[PDB]
């Protein structure tokens, strides 16, 4: 577990342009890969093209 979480978190930290490892990276890995939440350490919407396609399909369906 340790030699696995650390490996993922360090590369994730380096991705976003960081020179240090922080608790946020470890938290992201732990919450998204293992469903583990540790307390006490401090949105997507469709755009216009999708709406246009949906409107076209609805108009065809009537």
């Amino acid at each position: 577990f340790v030699d696995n979480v650390l490996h993922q978190a360090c590369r994730n930290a380096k991705e976003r342009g960081s020179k240090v490892l922080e608790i946020r990276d470890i938290q992201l890995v732990l919450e998204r890969v293992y469903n583990i939440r540790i307390p006490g350490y401090a949105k997507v919407q469709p755009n216009s093209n999708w709406i246009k396609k949906m409107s076209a399909v609805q108009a065809a369906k009537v």
Partner: protein, 123 residues
């Protein structure tokens, strides 16, 4: 009758591989699987971030830790579970070192394992 593209394409690809018949609802199953995989991968890549190619590669590598341990890979290809071959070789070395069991002609074909490992008193 109308039919979407990539469906004719998947069916032609299946035919080219020696399949002489298939049920109608295989193409749409494959299309929906592709939709789900794409959505999951890019939703992962969004959090690691505009999204770059490095974020996509890292999301794919992370996903590869708990699924897709199959395929038709050969020499040092991660198929059949993904186990290393040296580990399997040493497990085989440990197992095959014991002498084969001694069986008399009067118990050949009739002897069973111990009571702990058989289905007695199960009804």
């Amino acid at each position: 009758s109308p039919r979407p593209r990539d469906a004719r394409t998947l069916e032609l690809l299946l035919t080219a591989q020696g399949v002489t018949s298939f049920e109608p609802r295989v193409s749409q199953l494959l299309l929906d699987f592709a939709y789900r995989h794409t959505a999951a991968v890019l939703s992962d890549a969004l959090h690691l971030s505009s999204i770059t190619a490095n974020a996509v590669a890292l999301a794919i590598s992370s996903r590869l830790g708990y699924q897709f341990r199959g395929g038709g890979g050969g020499y040092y290809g991660g198929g059949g579970g993904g186990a290393s071959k040296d580990w399997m070789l040493e497990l085989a070395r440990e197992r095959n070192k014991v002498a084969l069991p001694r069986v008399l002609p009067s118990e050949w074909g009739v002897r069973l394992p111990g009571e702990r490992f058989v289905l007695s008193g199960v009804s």
